């Protein structure tokens, strides 16, 4: 309605968390005007030593970024035979890798590393495919799930824990003892759990995998300000159907990201490692958000809103979740070399010496080092 | 303004009904929370012997399944010739078991060519991206003085689109006298939207050629078959391409004695259920785990199954045969039985607490089909 | 809340104006029930002699029709080959009668190259699924200090540069602070439309065509020597429009001529009378007339989707523009249908005989344009 008529943005932090015998789940309230406008909601899910996230799915696509830690995920796709014990061709993800969890598709993840895996997943709760509502939803196939988004309700069992065990028994062609097992009416290990001892194993082919970190195929490289890598439907076609792309901006010492904006896409920045200055301006040239942003914090970017950032004394590296398979952007210092001189003159009231300046002066990169 | 955020679902039956000369129109209110979460409404239509349904068009598509009866139907596609001595457009014939797709904005008339009354359940996809108006259902009649089918959209008068135009401007627009054009306002017709054509029509008695209808009933089914619980037929885009432009689909399911429809859910679509024949148990479980609906469901009722919600059905001693509307040209669903045999063995034993023995029992036991029997 | 169950529709009038040093900008309030059911809003822009509209951009696409004057428009498409001491992108000239389309987030600037004011009708497709903000319209100026063009959301207005600081800004571009400070336009009164004393000696995806003329009878598909003609510009003509879901159709209706009752199957429609006057009739699904009355040269009329619209020209004809929210809006007229429905049908339908039936099916000559 007016979801974006916001005259002030925040660097929001998780408003909910759930303890677990396997890991930890931190969620960002979905009702914050910031996330309300962009029509999304993020969730920081962490996997302790040998963490195993029990299967579940959502009525909306999920773009997840593994910043710290590594592991292995498994999809439960329909039809596709369990070519990989009859299990689907399981997948192993690494740090800096990007994945897009299809809607209504149950998924399970296991930590195959020493360091606790920390991942950030963008819940496109306003996506095309989602035909329910804004309020996020998670349907777990197992375990006794502990509410991750209390806003939805304002107990909690899996989907199997809703049918009388006699029914499942007949359905699965088994006894009732095993039936109750599926109902998990007793278990109290919450969402994530740890696999003791270890774990064996040591369209259908639409590579839903892609590492964004790989500093090989970026876009701009300025060894005094940093670089920025983008991921979209071009390299990762799959994204096309879920309409979501991301970028991993890295700002060196005082490195600056020229005032840029997003044409056809909202943005939500996530500070991974670092601390820096960030400014966002709307129509009336207002500084809707002019402050510091560092690790853990999240910042929304209202589509055409203009934003610029500079790495702090410690530096600044983050990831941006945009809502469009092929999100485009442009930095003001580029528009200049696009608009004719005489137009720039009559616009800012500058002689041709200053106009001939802004253009040919500087480099062809939004990454500037003061 | 919370839509699908619901803890309980109510099986619904016709709210309003139109009693016309040669037909009947029963419509379910769109203001029903269960339907609102689906963004659709339904309209049961019954064409009495020799009954004709006055032409009309809606700002959104419609998926209709003729359950009982037969007849002829023709659309008024602009830009299409009268190719198929009269001068009409290639008229199409429909029989029970056929799924009809009425495009948005396109006028259409239907006629019952049989002796028994025709019965079809039209799923009004008002929340389609084609309707640029609003949520409420709208029908524009070209003739007669009909009764408001969906009186909720009004919250009682009516008339064809022409009843608004004066015979003057009308007689002039269509270059005709003040008599013909005068009747074109139908200031007479008490017959309403559906009229009895005593005697019948001698005529019978790509956008133009695109196959819109198809049969979903006939045992030509090739989806899932269990000759102990039933069978399931599907009609998506892959079969009826025309659906893509309208983003819809529907399934036909038959559950024999003790027919059990193992737990399944729709990966990307709101499911509306209408029972054509039968009476059984229907369970719907959301995310919290609890059941938003558990009870008996008899023929003639309607039920909504919100997208990712998990549902399961079982037919009584008399079986269970019903039609299911799915808002998506390619609604994809899956059953838990296929999930277990999809996730690594040791991944299940750590979840619901099981062991290699009983775990290998759920992966290799029973019929690979979702239709099970006790 | 229901937004299209409009009881009575009226003729929208520009209820606002932004006086600019080198021009003027008008806008139809975006709160009108009629304009809301269509999910749009129009903005009448005028560029006096040597008038120049400062660069800007909206999160939604825009379709404009030049109803007066000539000039030039320039875009700043990200990542393009500046084919042309001075390097700028591809400038594009435009005469009157041309229909322009502005991609969202794309900065554009228009300069009047003639002496007579340049007037254009801008359609702000705010309801487009390309605008992930809200319904409220928004303009992002890359320069000057613009006033509020849409106050229905402000209840001053610098540029996206005034938001930054002359310091950081000076750094982000590498230049003295005297430069960057001006890049904020602190003491600028000229507004969004300025005058270029002496004109510009310059004027005298980066491919896809954006504008195309409409007025020309070449794009006409319905000509009635005694009632006027109709010109259509849609997806198949301008492929680019496919990505913005917008179609333009010009209507030339001579005196006493008529546009037989018809309707749009898949789209809303905003009508703007560029010249003439006449009578307009719009019937809703309830078989009633939501709108009925005179329509002069300078008014806006909303025509909901499936609604049936019929209008007869006036003494001095009636040339109006049509904005259809669909890259290829498909319309059809009642008569064209009577020539497609079996002979026996129309019969029992309205109660006619083989005479009156064959009357319409025959007498009704194939053509939406009728000259009574
Ligand atoms: Mg950024
Ligand atoms: Mg079902
Ligand atoms: Mg018109």
Tab-separated table of C-alpha atoms in Angstrom, chain A residues 126-274:
chain	number	residue	atom	x	y	z
A	126	UNK	CA	6.476	-11.698	-1.558
A	127	UNK	CA	7.577	-13.853	-4.469
A	128	UNK	CA	5.392	-14.722	-7.445
A	129	UNK	CA	5.164	-18.435	-6.588
A	130	UNK	CA	4.040	-17.756	-3.022
A	131	UNK	CA	0.244	-17.933	-3.154
A	132	UNK	CA	-0.427	-17.808	0.591
A	133	UNK	CA	0.625	-14.545	2.241
A	134	UNK	CA	3.425	-12.327	3.537
A	135	UNK	CA	3.814	-14.066	6.902
A	136	UNK	CA	6.631	-16.621	6.463
A	137	UNK	CA	5.877	-20.309	6.969
A	138	UNK	CA	7.959	-23.436	7.505
A	139	UNK	CA	6.588	-26.970	7.241
A	140	UNK	CA	8.944	-29.455	8.891
A	141	UNK	CA	8.701	-33.139	8.016
A	142	UNK	CA	10.231	-34.201	11.339
A	143	UNK	CA	11.003	-33.107	14.886
A	144	UNK	CA	9.057	-30.775	17.171
A	145	UNK	CA	9.726	-27.354	15.560
A	146	UNK	CA	10.032	-24.379	17.886
A	147	UNK	CA	8.341	-21.294	16.406
A	148	UNK	CA	10.866	-19.382	14.290
A	149	UNK	CA	8.544	-16.511	13.343
A	150	UNK	CA	6.137	-15.747	16.224
A	151	UNK	CA	4.547	-13.004	14.113
A	152	UNK	CA	2.795	-15.727	12.112
A	153	UNK	CA	0.947	-17.022	15.177
A	154	UNK	CA	0.367	-13.668	16.903
A	155	UNK	CA	3.798	-25.610	20.927
A	156	UNK	CA	4.651	-26.459	17.329
A	157	UNK	CA	4.963	-29.861	15.688
A	158	UNK	CA	5.886	-31.188	12.247
A	159	UNK	CA	3.378	-32.029	9.511
A	160	UNK	CA	3.307	-35.748	10.319
A	161	UNK	CA	2.451	-34.885	13.918
A	162	UNK	CA	-1.028	-33.969	12.727
A	163	UNK	CA	-2.342	-37.329	11.562
A	164	UNK	CA	-3.398	-40.137	13.905
A	165	UNK	CA	-0.602	-42.732	13.961
A	166	UNK	CA	-3.087	-45.364	12.769
A	167	UNK	CA	-3.469	-43.377	9.560
A	168	UNK	CA	0.266	-43.106	8.891
A	169	UNK	CA	0.581	-46.784	9.783
A	170	UNK	CA	-1.900	-47.746	7.060
A	171	UNK	CA	-0.387	-45.182	4.696
A	172	UNK	CA	3.264	-46.170	5.142
A	173	UNK	CA	2.271	-49.832	5.466
A	174	UNK	CA	3.874	-50.062	8.914
A	175	UNK	CA	3.058	-50.534	12.604
A	176	UNK	CA	1.888	-47.795	14.969
A	177	UNK	CA	5.051	-47.738	17.082
A	178	UNK	CA	7.038	-46.563	14.077
A	179	UNK	CA	4.046	-44.361	13.263
A	180	UNK	CA	4.394	-42.344	16.470
A	181	UNK	CA	8.072	-42.054	15.596
A	182	UNK	CA	7.074	-40.046	12.521
A	183	UNK	CA	4.787	-37.982	14.751
A	184	UNK	CA	7.742	-37.254	17.055
A	185	UNK	CA	5.361	-36.341	19.936
A	186	UNK	CA	8.149	-36.840	22.480
A	187	UNK	CA	11.317	-35.470	20.848
A	188	UNK	CA	12.585	-32.169	22.264
A	189	UNK	CA	15.726	-31.501	20.212
A	190	UNK	CA	14.118	-28.557	18.391
A	191	UNK	CA	14.726	-27.659	14.729
A	192	UNK	CA	18.367	-28.706	14.313
A	193	UNK	CA	20.060	-31.827	15.703
A	194	UNK	CA	23.524	-33.425	15.655
A	195	UNK	CA	24.330	-36.724	13.945
A	196	UNK	CA	26.269	-38.816	16.470
A	197	UNK	CA	29.241	-40.865	15.296
A	198	UNK	CA	29.139	-39.223	11.887
A	199	UNK	CA	27.196	-39.891	8.690
A	200	UNK	CA	27.637	-42.342	5.800
A	201	UNK	CA	27.912	-41.454	2.112
A	202	UNK	CA	31.636	-40.684	1.902
A	203	UNK	CA	15.328	-29.889	-14.084
A	204	UNK	CA	16.700	-32.628	-11.820
A	205	UNK	CA	20.088	-31.431	-13.062
A	206	UNK	CA	19.590	-27.647	-12.962
A	207	UNK	CA	22.765	-26.681	-11.088
A	208	UNK	CA	21.254	-24.751	-8.192
A	209	UNK	CA	24.819	-24.344	-6.940
A	210	UNK	CA	27.224	-21.433	-7.445
A	211	UNK	CA	29.986	-19.893	-5.323
A	212	UNK	CA	29.897	-16.086	-5.219
A	213	UNK	CA	33.150	-15.671	-3.286
A	214	UNK	CA	35.389	-16.987	-6.097
A	215	UNK	CA	37.360	-13.778	-6.854
A	216	UNK	CA	37.756	-14.895	-10.480
A	217	UNK	CA	34.652	-13.664	-12.302
A	218	UNK	CA	33.784	-10.354	-10.637
A	219	UNK	CA	32.950	-7.027	-12.272
A	220	UNK	CA	35.117	-4.237	-10.885
A	221	UNK	CA	38.613	-4.518	-9.408
A	222	UNK	CA	40.141	-1.540	-7.600
A	223	UNK	CA	43.067	-2.687	-5.379
A	224	UNK	CA	42.573	0.398	-3.198
A	225	UNK	CA	38.806	0.277	-2.710
A	226	UNK	CA	38.032	-3.395	-3.297
A	227	UNK	CA	35.869	-5.341	-5.737
A	228	UNK	CA	32.312	-6.593	-6.191
A	229	UNK	CA	31.002	-9.886	-7.548
A	230	UNK	CA	27.476	-10.338	-8.889
A	231	UNK	CA	25.429	-13.498	-9.429
A	232	UNK	CA	22.437	-13.653	-11.765
A	233	UNK	CA	20.475	-15.754	-14.270
A	234	UNK	CA	23.256	-15.274	-16.829
A	235	UNK	CA	25.754	-17.507	-15.024
A	236	UNK	CA	23.125	-19.161	-12.837
A	237	UNK	CA	20.093	-19.618	-15.158
A	238	UNK	CA	18.015	-21.300	-12.437
A	239	UNK	CA	17.637	-17.941	-10.674
A	240	UNK	CA	15.506	-16.848	-13.637
A	241	UNK	CA	12.477	-18.761	-12.287
A	242	UNK	CA	12.822	-17.492	-8.717
A	243	UNK	CA	13.663	-13.927	-9.692
A	244	UNK	CA	16.487	-13.242	-7.240
A	245	UNK	CA	20.129	-12.225	-7.651
A	246	UNK	CA	22.901	-11.244	-5.241
A	247	UNK	CA	26.227	-9.413	-4.982
A	248	UNK	CA	29.218	-9.646	-2.640
A	249	UNK	CA	30.679	-6.163	-2.226
A	250	UNK	CA	34.096	-5.765	-0.613
A	251	UNK	CA	35.408	-2.341	0.403
A	252	UNK	CA	39.074	-2.019	1.372
A	253	UNK	CA	40.428	0.836	3.476
A	254	UNK	CA	38.068	3.782	3.044
A	255	UNK	CA	37.137	2.131	-0.247
A	256	UNK	CA	34.067	3.814	-1.707
A	257	UNK	CA	31.097	2.486	-3.674
A	258	UNK	CA	30.067	5.388	-5.921
A	259	UNK	CA	26.474	6.565	-5.359
A	260	UNK	CA	24.560	3.800	-7.119
A	261	UNK	CA	20.943	2.637	-7.266
A	262	UNK	CA	18.816	-0.336	-8.284
A	263	UNK	CA	16.434	0.184	-11.195
A	264	UNK	CA	14.257	-2.931	-11.226
A	265	UNK	CA	14.901	-4.484	-7.817
A	266	UNK	CA	14.764	-3.949	-4.063
A	267	UNK	CA	17.866	-4.673	-2.018
A	268	UNK	CA	18.790	-5.960	1.406
A	269	UNK	CA	22.434	-5.687	2.400
A	270	UNK	CA	24.004	-8.036	4.929
A	271	UNK	CA	27.273	-7.074	6.602
A	272	UNK	CA	29.423	-10.200	6.775
A	273	UNK	CA	32.850	-9.073	7.990
A	274	UNK	CA	33.656	-5.446	8.722
